[PDB]
Amino acid sequence: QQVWKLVIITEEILLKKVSKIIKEAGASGYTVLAAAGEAYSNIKFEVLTASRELADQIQDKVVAKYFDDYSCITYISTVEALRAH
Amino acid sequence: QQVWKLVIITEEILLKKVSKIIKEAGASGYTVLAAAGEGAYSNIKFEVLTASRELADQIQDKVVAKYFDDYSCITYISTVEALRA
Amino acid sequence: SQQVWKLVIITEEILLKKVSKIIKEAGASGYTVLAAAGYSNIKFEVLTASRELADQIQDKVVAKYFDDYSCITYISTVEALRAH
């Protein structure tokens, strides 16, 4: 089983709106960590998706909607051996 | 020749018990990060770097067999290059 | 379509500014810093459009420290990068 990991790094304030985007898309497990750019006023999302299309779907939505007016970093990579509960 | 990274995302309460499995299997070294997760940061993220896929598989089966049914737990594996430690 | 390298440096908190300046001076866009535990460490994630640039930052860092500071570092690749 190949799984995709979508990282979104944005500003703390966007925690609730970006979480909501993630759920309403139907994610299978997302994690958040606190982070600092160049104070831990940023947050890092890690969203695991069964298809590259859903990862692309969530990335497109967050970019189109917040990429311009907020500091944002997003990227995708593949992972193996997902066991999730 | 190949380094593998094993991620275990689980409840903060298993920090000692998961740390024990990781140590008793004799890994290249690990880091733990506070985190929060859904479908405050009450979870922990282990990143375990192993010299072989088999060792990573072995730490992972164990954790899974022991704690997966009863605790929120996410785990998966991927490859890294250029490891200095 | 767009292959990108991600350098991870996990090191003692005491070296924040030092390695931050190595990452700066080496010309990389920026980075992310996460607090971690080994006790208390920082984890840098640096994105480079060139594998070249990742290994320079790696070289200088492990050159100076590593031999008398706790240090883990490694590289991998990501794709579909967007940044602002």
Coordinates of N, CA and C in Angstrom, one line a residue:
Chain A
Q1 N 0.8 -1.2 0.0 CA 0.0 0.0 0.0 C 0.8 1.3 0.0
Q2 N 0.7 2.0 -1.1 CA 1.4 3.3 -1.2 C 0.4 4.4 -0.7
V3 N 0.9 5.3 0.2 CA 0.1 6.4 0.8 C 0.9 7.7 0.5
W4 N 0.2 8.8 0.4 CA 0.7 10.1 0.2 C 0.7 11.0 1.5
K5 N 1.8 11.7 1.7 CA 1.8 12.6 2.8 C 1.8 14.1 2.3
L6 N 0.9 14.9 2.8 CA 0.8 16.3 2.3 C 1.1 17.1 3.5
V7 N 2.2 17.8 3.4 CA 2.6 18.8 4.5 C 2.1 20.2 4.1
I8 N 1.4 20.8 5.0 CA 1.0 22.3 4.9 C 1.6 23.0 6.1
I9 N 2.5 23.9 5.9 CA 3.0 24.8 7.0 C 2.4 26.2 6.8
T10 N 1.6 26.6 7.8 CA 1.0 28.0 7.7 C 1.0 28.6 9.1
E11 N 0.4 29.8 9.2 CA 0.4 30.5 10.5 C -0.6 30.0 11.4
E12 N -0.3 30.0 12.7 CA -1.1 29.5 13.8 C -2.6 29.8 13.6
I13 N -2.9 31.1 13.2 CA -4.3 31.6 13.2 C -5.2 30.7 12.3
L14 N -4.6 30.1 11.3 CA -5.3 29.3 10.3 C -5.6 27.9 10.8
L15 N -5.3 27.6 12.0 CA -5.5 26.2 12.6 C -6.9 25.7 12.3
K16 N -7.9 26.5 12.6 CA -9.3 25.9 12.6 C -9.8 25.8 11.2
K17 N -9.6 26.8 10.3 CA -10.1 26.8 9.0 C -9.4 25.7 8.1
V18 N -8.1 25.5 8.4 CA -7.4 24.5 7.6 C -7.8 23.0 8.1
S19 N -7.9 22.9 9.4 CA -8.4 21.6 9.9 C -9.7 21.3 9.3
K20 N -10.7 22.2 9.3 CA -12.0 22.0 8.7 C -11.9 21.6 7.2
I21 N -11.1 22.3 6.5 CA -10.9 21.9 5.1 C -10.4 20.4 5.0
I22 N -9.6 20.0 5.9 CA -9.0 18.7 5.9 C -10.0 17.6 6.1
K23 N -10.8 17.7 7.2 CA -11.9 16.8 7.5 C -12.9 16.8 6.4
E24 N -13.5 17.9 6.0 CA -14.6 17.9 5.0 C -14.1 17.3 3.7
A25 N -12.8 17.2 3.5 CA -12.3 16.4 2.3 C -12.3 14.9 2.5
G26 N -12.3 14.5 3.8 CA -12.3 13.1 4.1 C -10.9 12.5 4.2
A27 N -10.1 13.1 5.2 CA -8.8 12.6 5.4 C -8.8 11.3 6.4
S28 N -7.8 10.5 6.3 CA -7.7 9.3 7.1 C -6.8 9.5 8.3
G29 N -6.3 10.7 8.6 CA -5.4 11.0 9.7 C -4.5 12.1 9.5
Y30 N -4.7 13.2 10.3 CA -3.8 14.3 10.2 C -3.2 14.7 11.5
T31 N -2.0 15.2 11.5 CA -1.2 15.6 12.6 C -0.8 17.0 12.5
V32 N -0.7 17.7 13.6 CA -0.3 19.1 13.7 C 0.9 19.2 14.7
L33 N 1.9 19.9 14.3 CA 3.0 20.3 15.2 C 3.3 21.8 15.1
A34 N 3.8 22.3 16.2 CA 4.1 23.8 16.2 C 5.4 24.0 15.5
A35 N 5.6 25.2 14.9 CA 6.8 25.4 14.1 C 7.1 26.9 14.1
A36 N 8.3 27.2 13.7 CA 8.9 28.5 13.6 C 9.6 28.7 12.3
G37 N 9.3 29.9 11.7 CA 10.0 30.2 10.4 C 11.3 30.9 10.6
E38 N 11.6 31.8 9.8 CA 12.9 32.6 9.9 C 12.6 34.1 9.9
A39 N 9.9 32.1 17.6 CA 8.6 31.9 18.2 C 7.8 30.9 17.3
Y40 N 7.2 29.9 18.0 CA 6.4 28.9 17.4 C 5.0 29.4 17.0
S41 N 5.0 30.4 16.1 CA 3.7 31.0 15.7 C 3.2 30.4 14.4
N42 N 3.9 29.4 13.9 CA 3.5 28.6 12.7 C 3.0 27.2 13.2
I43 N 2.4 26.5 12.3 CA 1.9 25.2 12.5 C 2.2 24.4 11.3
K44 N 2.5 23.1 11.5 CA 2.8 22.1 10.4 C 1.7 21.0 10.4
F45 N 1.0 20.9 9.3 CA 0.0 19.8 9.1 C 0.7 18.7 8.4
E46 N 0.4 17.5 8.8 CA 0.7 16.3 8.1 C -0.5 15.5 7.8
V47 N -0.9 15.3 6.6 CA -2.2 14.7 6.2 C -1.8 13.5 5.3
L48 N -2.3 12.3 5.7 CA -2.0 11.1 5.0 C -3.2 10.7 4.1
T49 N -3.0 10.5 2.9 CA -4.1 10.2 2.0 C -3.8 9.0 1.1
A50 N -4.9 8.2 0.9 CA -4.8 7.0 0.1 C -4.5 7.2 -1.3
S51 N -4.8 8.4 -1.9 CA -4.7 8.6 -3.3 C -3.9 10.0 -3.4
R52 N -3.1 10.1 -4.5 CA -2.5 11.3 -4.8 C -3.5 12.4 -5.2
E53 N -4.7 11.9 -5.7 CA -5.7 12.9 -6.1 C -6.3 13.6 -4.9
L54 N -6.5 12.9 -3.8 CA -7.1 13.6 -2.6 C -6.0 14.6 -2.0
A55 N -4.8 14.1 -1.9 CA -3.7 15.1 -1.5 C -3.7 16.3 -2.4
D56 N -3.7 16.1 -3.7 CA -3.8 17.2 -4.7 C -5.0 18.1 -4.4
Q57 N -6.1 17.4 -4.1 CA -7.4 18.1 -3.9 C -7.3 19.1 -2.7
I58 N -6.7 18.6 -1.5 CA -6.6 19.4 -0.3 C -5.5 20.5 -0.5
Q59 N -4.4 20.2 -1.2 CA -3.4 21.2 -1.5 C -4.0 22.3 -2.3
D60 N -4.7 22.0 -3.5 CA -5.3 23.0 -4.3 C -6.2 23.9 -3.5
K61 N -7.1 23.3 -2.7 CA -8.0 24.1 -1.9 C -7.3 25.1 -0.9
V62 N -6.3 24.6 -0.1 CA -5.6 25.5 0.8 C -4.8 26.6 0.0
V63 N -4.2 26.2 -1.1 CA -3.4 27.2 -1.9 C -4.3 28.3 -2.5
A64 N -5.3 27.9 -3.3 CA -6.2 28.8 -3.9 C -6.8 29.8 -2.9
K65 N -7.1 29.3 -1.6 CA -7.8 30.1 -0.7 C -6.9 30.9 0.3
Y66 N -5.7 30.4 0.6 CA -4.9 31.2 1.6 C -3.5 31.5 1.1
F67 N -3.0 30.9 0.0 CA -1.6 31.0 -0.4 C -1.2 32.5 -0.6
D68 N -2.1 33.3 -1.0 CA -1.7 34.7 -1.4 C -1.5 35.6 -0.2
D69 N -2.4 35.5 0.8 CA -2.5 36.5 1.8 C -1.8 36.0 3.1
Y70 N -1.3 34.7 3.1 CA -0.6 34.2 4.3 C 0.7 33.5 3.9
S71 N 1.6 33.3 4.9 CA 2.8 32.6 4.6 C 2.4 31.1 4.6
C72 N 2.8 30.4 3.5 CA 2.4 29.0 3.4 C 3.5 28.2 2.6
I73 N 3.7 27.0 3.0 CA 4.6 26.1 2.4 C 3.9 24.7 2.3
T74 N 3.8 24.2 1.2 CA 3.1 22.9 1.1 C 3.9 22.0 0.1
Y75 N 3.9 20.7 0.3 CA 4.5 19.7 -0.5 C 4.0 18.3 -0.2
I76 N 4.3 17.4 -1.1 CA 3.8 16.0 -1.0 C 4.9 15.0 -1.1
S77 N 4.8 13.9 -0.4 CA 5.7 12.8 -0.6 C 5.0 11.5 -0.4
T78 N 5.6 10.4 -0.8 CA 5.0 9.1 -0.6 C 5.5 8.4 0.6
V79 N 4.7 7.5 1.2 CA 5.1 6.8 2.4 C 4.5 5.3 2.2
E80 N 5.1 4.4 3.0 CA 4.7 3.0 3.0 C 4.3 2.6 4.4
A81 N 3.6 1.4 4.4 CA 3.4 0.6 5.6 C 2.4 1.3 6.6
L82 N 1.5 2.0 6.0 CA 0.5 2.7 6.9 C -0.3 1.8 7.7
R83 N -0.2 1.9 9.0 CA -1.2 1.3 9.9 C -1.8 2.4 10.8
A84 N -3.1 2.6 10.7 CA -3.8 3.7 11.3 C -5.0 3.4 12.1
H85 N -5.1 4.0 13.3 CA -6.2 3.8 14.2 C -6.4 5.0 15.1
Chain B
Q1 N 23.4 0.1 3.7 CA 23.5 0.8 2.4 C 22.3 1.8 2.3
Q2 N 21.1 1.4 2.7 CA 19.9 2.3 2.6 C 19.4 2.6 4.0
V3 N 19.1 3.8 4.3 CA 18.5 4.2 5.6 C 17.0 4.4 5.5
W4 N 16.2 3.9 6.4 CA 14.8 4.0 6.5 C 14.4 4.7 7.7
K5 N 13.3 5.5 7.6 CA 12.7 6.3 8.6 C 11.3 5.7 9.0
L6 N 11.2 5.4 10.3 CA 9.9 4.9 10.8 C 9.3 5.9 11.7
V7 N 8.0 6.2 11.4 CA 7.2 7.2 12.1 C 6.2 6.4 12.9
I8 N 6.1 6.8 14.2 CA 5.1 6.3 15.1 C 4.4 7.5 15.7
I9 N 3.1 7.7 15.5 CA 2.4 8.8 16.1 C 1.4 8.2 17.0
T10 N 1.5 8.5 18.3 CA 0.7 7.8 19.3 C 0.5 8.7 20.5
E11 N -0.3 8.2 21.5 CA -0.7 9.0 22.6 C 0.5 9.2 23.6
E12 N 0.6 10.4 24.2 CA 1.7 10.8 25.0 C 2.0 9.8 26.1
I13 N 1.0 9.0 26.5 CA 1.1 8.1 27.6 C 2.0 6.9 27.4
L14 N 2.2 6.5 26.1 CA 3.1 5.4 25.7 C 4.5 5.8 25.5
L15 N 4.9 7.0 26.0 CA 6.3 7.4 25.7 C 7.3 6.5 26.2
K16 N 7.2 6.1 27.5 CA 8.2 5.1 28.0 C 8.1 3.8 27.3
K17 N 6.9 3.3 27.2 CA 6.7 1.9 26.6 C 7.1 1.8 25.2
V18 N 6.9 2.9 24.4 CA 7.4 2.8 23.0 C 8.9 3.0 22.9
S19 N 9.4 4.0 23.7 CA 10.8 4.2 23.8 C 11.5 2.9 24.2
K20 N 10.9 2.0 25.0 CA 11.6 0.8 25.4 C 11.7 -0.2 24.2
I21 N 10.6 -0.4 23.5 CA 10.7 -1.2 22.3 C 11.8 -0.7 21.4
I22 N 11.8 0.6 21.1 CA 12.8 1.2 20.2 C 14.2 0.9 20.7
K23 N 14.5 1.2 22.0 CA 15.8 0.9 22.5 C 16.2 -0.5 22.5
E24 N 15.3 -1.4 23.0 CA 15.6 -2.8 23.0 C 15.9 -3.4 21.6
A25 N 15.5 -2.7 20.6 CA 15.8 -3.2 19.2 C 17.1 -2.6 18.7
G26 N 17.7 -1.7 19.4 CA 18.9 -1.1 19.1 C 18.9 -0.4 17.7
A27 N 18.4 0.8 17.7 CA 18.3 1.6 16.5 C 19.4 2.6 16.4
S28 N 19.5 3.2 15.2 CA 20.5 4.3 15.0 C 20.2 5.5 15.8
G29 N 19.0 5.7 16.3 CA 18.7 6.9 17.1 C 17.3 7.4 16.8
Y30 N 16.7 8.1 17.8 CA 15.4 8.5 17.6 C 15.2 9.9 18.1
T31 N 14.1 10.6 17.6 CA 13.7 11.9 18.1 C 12.2 11.8 18.3
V32 N 11.7 12.6 19.3 CA 10.3 12.7 19.6 C 9.8 14.1 19.5
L33 N 8.6 14.3 19.0 CA 8.1 15.6 18.8 C 6.7 15.7 19.4
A34 N 6.4 16.7 20.2 CA 5.0 16.9 20.6 C 4.1 17.2 19.4
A35 N 2.9 16.7 19.4 CA 2.0 16.9 18.3 C 0.5 16.8 18.7
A36 N -0.4 17.3 17.9 CA -1.8 17.1 18.1 C -2.4 16.5 16.8
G37 N -3.5 15.8 17.0 CA -4.0 15.1 15.8 C -5.5 14.7 15.8
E38 N -6.1 14.7 14.7 CA -7.5 14.4 14.5 C -7.7 13.6 13.2
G39 N -8.9 13.2 12.9 CA -9.2 12.5 11.7 C -8.8 13.1 10.4
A40 N -4.5 21.4 22.5 CA -3.2 21.1 22.9 C -2.6 19.8 22.3
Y41 N -1.3 19.6 22.5 CA -0.6 18.6 21.8 C -0.4 17.4 22.8
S42 N -1.4 16.5 22.8 CA -1.5 15.4 23.7 C -1.0 14.1 23.0
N43 N -0.3 14.2 21.9 CA 0.3 13.1 21.2 C 1.8 13.3 21.1
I44 N 2.5 12.2 20.7 CA 3.9 12.3 20.4 C 4.2 11.6 19.0
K45 N 5.2 12.1 18.4 CA 5.6 11.6 17.1 C 7.0 11.1 17.3
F46 N 7.2 9.8 17.2 CA 8.6 9.2 17.1 C 9.0 9.2 15.7
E47 N 10.3 9.7 15.4 CA 11.0 9.4 14.2 C 12.2 8.5 14.5
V48 N 12.2 7.3 14.0 CA 13.2 6.3 14.2 C 14.0 6.0 12.9
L49 N 15.2 6.3 12.9 CA 16.1 6.0 11.7 C 16.7 4.6 11.9
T50 N 16.5 3.7 10.9 CA 17.0 2.3 11.0 C 17.9 2.0 9.8
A51 N 19.0 1.3 10.1 CA 19.9 0.9 9.1 C 19.4 0.0 8.0
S52 N 18.2 -0.7 8.4 CA 17.6 -1.6 7.4 C 16.1 -1.6 7.5
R53 N 15.5 -1.9 6.4 CA 14.0 -2.0 6.4 C 13.5 -3.0 7.4
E54 N 14.2 -4.1 7.5 CA 13.8 -5.2 8.4 C 13.7 -4.7 9.9
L55 N 14.7 -4.0 10.3 CA 14.7 -3.5 11.7 C 13.5 -2.5 11.8
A56 N 13.2 -1.7 10.8 CA 12.1 -0.8 11.0 C 10.7 -1.5 11.0
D57 N 10.6 -2.5 10.1 CA 9.5 -3.4 10.2 C 9.3 -4.1 11.5
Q58 N 10.5 -4.4 12.2 CA 10.4 -5.1 13.4 C 9.9 -4.2 14.6
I59 N 10.6 -3.1 14.8 CA 10.0 -2.1 15.7 C 8.6 -1.9 15.5
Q60 N 8.2 -1.8 14.2 CA 6.8 -1.4 13.9 C 5.8 -2.5 14.3
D61 N 6.0 -3.7 13.8 CA 5.3 -4.9 14.4 C 5.9 -5.1 15.8
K62 N 5.0 -4.9 16.8 CA 5.5 -4.9 18.2 C 4.7 -3.8 18.8
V63 N 5.1 -2.6 18.4 CA 4.2 -1.4 18.7 C 2.8 -1.7 18.2
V64 N 2.7 -2.1 16.9 CA 1.3 -2.3 16.4 C 0.7 -3.5 17.1
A65 N 1.4 -4.6 17.2 CA 0.8 -5.8 17.9 C 0.4 -5.5 19.4
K66 N 1.2 -4.7 20.0 CA 1.0 -4.4 21.4 C -0.1 -3.3 21.6
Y67 N -0.1 -2.2 20.9 CA -0.9 -1.0 21.3 C -1.9 -0.6 20.3
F68 N -1.9 -1.2 19.1 CA -2.7 -0.6 18.0 C -4.2 -0.7 18.3
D69 N -4.7 -1.9 18.9 CA -6.1 -2.0 19.1 C -6.6 -1.0 20.1
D70 N -5.8 -0.6 21.1 CA -6.3 0.1 22.3 C -6.0 1.6 22.3
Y71 N -5.1 2.1 21.4 CA -4.7 3.5 21.5 C -4.6 4.0 20.0
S72 N -5.0 5.3 19.9 CA -4.7 6.1 18.7 C -3.2 5.9 18.3
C73 N -3.0 5.4 17.1 CA -1.7 5.1 16.7 C -1.6 5.2 15.2
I74 N -0.7 5.9 14.7 CA -0.4 6.0 13.3 C 1.1 5.6 13.1
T75 N 1.3 4.8 12.1 CA 2.7 4.5 11.8 C 2.9 4.3 10.3
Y76 N 4.1 4.5 9.9 CA 4.5 4.3 8.5 C 6.0 4.5 8.3
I77 N 6.5 4.2 7.1 CA 7.9 4.1 6.9 C 8.3 4.8 5.6
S78 N 9.5 5.4 5.5 CA 9.9 5.9 4.2 C 11.5 5.9 4.2
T79 N 12.1 6.2 3.1 CA 13.5 6.2 2.9 C 14.1 7.6 3.0
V80 N 15.3 7.6 3.6 CA 16.1 8.8 3.6 C 17.6 8.5 3.2
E81 N 18.3 9.4 2.7 CA 19.6 9.4 2.2 C 20.5 10.3 3.0
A82 N 21.8 10.0 3.0 CA 22.9 11.0 3.4 C 22.9 11.1 4.9
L83 N 22.7 10.0 5.7 CA 22.6 10.1 7.1 C 24.0 10.2 7.8
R84 N 24.1 11.3 8.5 CA 25.2 11.5 9.5 C 24.7 11.6 10.9
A85 N 25.4 11.0 11.8 CA 24.8 11.0 13.2 C 25.9 11.0 14.3
Chain C
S1 N 6.6 16.3 -11.6 CA 7.1 17.3 -12.5 C 8.2 18.1 -11.8
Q2 N 8.2 18.3 -10.5 CA 9.1 19.2 -9.8 C 9.7 18.5 -8.6
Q3 N 10.9 18.0 -8.8 CA 11.6 17.2 -7.7 C 12.4 18.2 -6.9
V4 N 12.2 18.1 -5.5 CA 12.8 19.0 -4.6 C 13.5 18.2 -3.5
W5 N 14.6 18.7 -3.0 CA 15.3 18.0 -1.9 C 15.0 18.7 -0.5
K6 N 14.8 17.9 0.5 CA 14.5 18.4 1.9 C 15.6 17.9 2.8
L7 N 16.4 18.8 3.4 CA 17.4 18.5 4.3 C 16.9 18.6 5.7
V8 N 17.1 17.6 6.6 CA 16.7 17.6 8.0 C 17.9 17.6 8.8
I9 N 18.0 18.6 9.8 CA 19.1 18.7 10.7 C 18.5 18.8 12.1
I10 N 18.8 17.8 12.9 CA 18.3 17.7 14.3 C 19.5 17.8 15.2
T11 N 19.4 18.9 16.1 CA 20.6 19.3 16.8 C 20.2 20.0 18.1
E12 N 21.1 20.1 19.0 CA 20.9 20.7 20.3 C 20.3 22.1 20.2
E13 N 19.4 22.5 21.1 CA 18.7 23.8 21.0 C 19.7 24.9 20.9
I14 N 20.8 24.8 21.7 CA 21.8 25.8 21.9 C 22.4 26.3 20.6
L15 N 22.3 25.5 19.6 CA 22.8 25.9 18.3 C 21.9 26.5 17.3
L16 N 20.8 27.1 17.7 CA 19.8 27.7 16.9 C 20.3 28.7 15.9
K17 N 20.8 29.8 16.4 CA 21.3 30.9 15.6 C 22.5 30.5 14.7
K18 N 23.4 29.7 15.2 CA 24.5 29.2 14.5 C 24.2 28.5 13.2
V19 N 23.4 27.5 13.3 CA 22.9 26.7 12.1 C 21.9 27.5 11.3
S20 N 21.1 28.3 12.0 CA 20.2 29.2 11.2 C 21.0 30.1 10.3
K21 N 22.3 30.5 10.7 CA 23.1 31.4 9.9 C 23.8 30.6 8.8
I22 N 24.2 29.4 9.1 CA 24.7 28.5 8.1 C 23.7 28.3 7.0
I23 N 22.4 28.1 7.3 CA 21.4 27.9 6.4 C 21.1 29.2 5.6
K24 N 21.2 30.3 6.3 CA 21.1 31.6 5.7 C 22.2 31.9 4.7
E25 N 23.4 31.9 5.2 CA 24.6 32.2 4.4 C 24.7 31.3 3.2
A26 N 24.3 30.0 3.3 CA 24.4 29.1 2.2 C 23.4 29.4 1.1
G27 N 22.5 30.4 1.3 CA 21.6 30.8 0.2 C 20.3 30.2 0.1
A28 N 19.9 29.3 1.0 CA 18.6 28.7 0.9 C 17.4 29.6 1.2
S29 N 16.3 29.4 0.5 CA 15.1 30.2 0.6 C 14.8 30.5 2.1
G30 N 14.6 29.5 2.9 CA 14.3 29.6 4.3 C 14.3 28.2 4.9
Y31 N 13.5 28.0 6.0 CA 13.5 26.7 6.7 C 12.3 26.7 7.6
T32 N 12.1 25.6 8.2 CA 11.1 25.4 9.3 C 11.9 24.8 10.5
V33 N 11.5 25.2 11.7 CA 12.2 24.8 12.9 C 11.1 24.2 13.8
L34 N 11.3 23.0 14.3 CA 10.4 22.3 15.2 C 11.2 21.9 16.5
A35 N 10.5 22.0 17.6 CA 11.2 21.6 18.9 C 11.0 20.1 19.0
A36 N 12.1 19.5 19.5 CA 12.2 18.0 19.5 C 12.9 17.6 20.8
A37 N 13.0 16.3 21.0 CA 13.6 15.7 22.2 C 14.4 14.5 21.8
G38 N 15.6 14.4 22.3 CA 16.6 13.3 21.9 C 16.6 12.1 22.8
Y39 N 18.8 16.7 25.8 CA 17.4 16.3 25.8 C 16.6 17.1 24.8
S40 N 16.5 18.4 25.0 CA 15.7 19.3 24.1 C 16.6 19.6 22.9
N41 N 16.0 19.3 21.7 CA 16.7 19.6 20.4 C 15.8 20.4 19.5
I42 N 16.4 20.9 18.4 CA 15.6 21.5 17.3 C 15.8 20.7 16.1
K43 N 14.8 20.7 15.2 CA 14.8 20.0 14.0 C 14.6 21.0 12.8
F44 N 15.6 21.2 12.0 CA 15.5 22.1 10.8 C 15.0 21.3 9.7
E45 N 14.1 21.8 8.9 CA 13.7 21.3 7.6 C 14.0 22.4 6.5
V46 N 15.0 22.1 5.6 CA 15.4 23.1 4.6 C 15.1 22.5 3.3
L47 N 14.4 23.3 2.5 CA 14.1 22.9 1.1 C 15.0 23.5 0.1
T48 N 15.5 22.7 -0.8 CA 16.4 23.2 -1.8 C 16.0 22.7 -3.2
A49 N 16.0 23.6 -4.2 CA 15.7 23.1 -5.6 C 16.8 22.4 -6.2
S50 N 18.0 22.4 -5.5 CA 19.2 21.7 -6.0 C 19.7 20.7 -5.0
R51 N 20.0 19.5 -5.3 CA 20.7 18.6 -4.4 C 22.0 19.1 -4.0
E52 N 22.7 19.8 -4.9 CA 23.9 20.5 -4.6 C 23.8 21.3 -3.3
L53 N 22.9 22.2 -3.2 CA 22.7 23.1 -2.1 C 22.4 22.5 -0.8
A54 N 21.7 21.3 -0.8 CA 21.5 20.6 0.4 C 22.8 20.1 1.0
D55 N 23.6 19.5 0.2 CA 24.8 18.9 0.7 C 25.9 19.9 1.2
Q56 N 25.9 21.1 0.6 CA 26.8 22.1 1.2 C 26.4 22.5 2.6
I57 N 25.1 22.7 2.8 CA 24.6 23.0 4.1 C 24.8 21.9 5.1
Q58 N 24.7 20.6 4.6 CA 25.0 19.5 5.4 C 26.5 19.5 5.8
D59 N 27.4 19.7 4.8 CA 28.8 19.6 5.0 C 29.3 20.5 6.1
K60 N 29.0 21.8 6.0 CA 29.5 22.8 6.9 C 29.0 22.5 8.3
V61 N 27.7 22.1 8.4 CA 27.1 21.9 9.7 C 27.8 20.8 10.5
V62 N 27.9 19.6 9.8 CA 28.5 18.4 10.5 C 30.1 18.6 10.6
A63 N 30.6 19.5 9.7 CA 32.0 19.9 9.8 C 32.3 20.5 11.2
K64 N 31.6 21.5 11.5 CA 31.8 22.2 12.8 C 31.3 21.4 14.0
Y65 N 30.1 21.0 14.0 CA 29.6 20.3 15.2 C 29.7 18.8 14.9
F66 N 28.8 18.0 15.5 CA 28.8 16.5 15.3 C 29.8 15.9 16.1
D67 N 31.1 16.3 16.0 CA 32.2 15.8 16.7 C 32.2 16.2 18.2
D68 N 31.5 17.2 18.6 CA 31.3 17.6 20.0 C 29.9 18.2 20.3
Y69 N 28.9 17.8 19.5 CA 27.6 18.2 19.7 C 26.7 17.1 19.1
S70 N 25.6 16.8 19.8 CA 24.6 15.8 19.3 C 24.0 16.3 18.0
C71 N 24.0 15.4 17.0 CA 23.7 15.9 15.6 C 23.2 14.7 14.8
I72 N 22.0 14.8 14.2 CA 21.5 13.9 13.2 C 21.1 14.8 12.0
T73 N 21.4 14.3 10.8 CA 21.0 15.0 9.6 C 20.9 14.0 8.5
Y74 N 20.1 14.3 7.5 CA 19.8 13.4 6.4 C 19.0 14.1 5.4
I75 N 18.9 13.6 4.2 CA 18.2 14.2 3.0 C 17.1 13.3 2.5
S76 N 16.1 13.8 1.9 CA 15.2 13.1 1.1 C 14.6 14.0 0.1
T77 N 13.6 13.5 -0.7 CA 12.9 14.3 -1.7 C 11.4 14.5 -1.4
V78 N 10.9 15.6 -1.9 CA 9.4 15.8 -1.9 C 9.1 16.3 -3.3
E79 N 7.8 16.4 -3.5 CA 7.4 17.0 -4.8 C 6.2 18.0 -4.6
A80 N 5.7 18.5 -5.7 CA 4.5 19.4 -5.6 C 4.6 20.5 -4.7
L81 N 5.8 21.1 -4.7 CA 6.2 22.2 -3.8 C 5.5 23.5 -4.2
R82 N 4.9 24.2 -3.2 CA 4.4 25.6 -3.3 C 4.7 26.3 -2.0
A83 N 5.2 27.5 -2.1 CA 5.8 28.3 -1.0 C 5.5 29.8 -1.2
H84 N 5.4 30.5 0.0 CA 5.1 31.9 -0.1 C 5.3 32.6 1.3

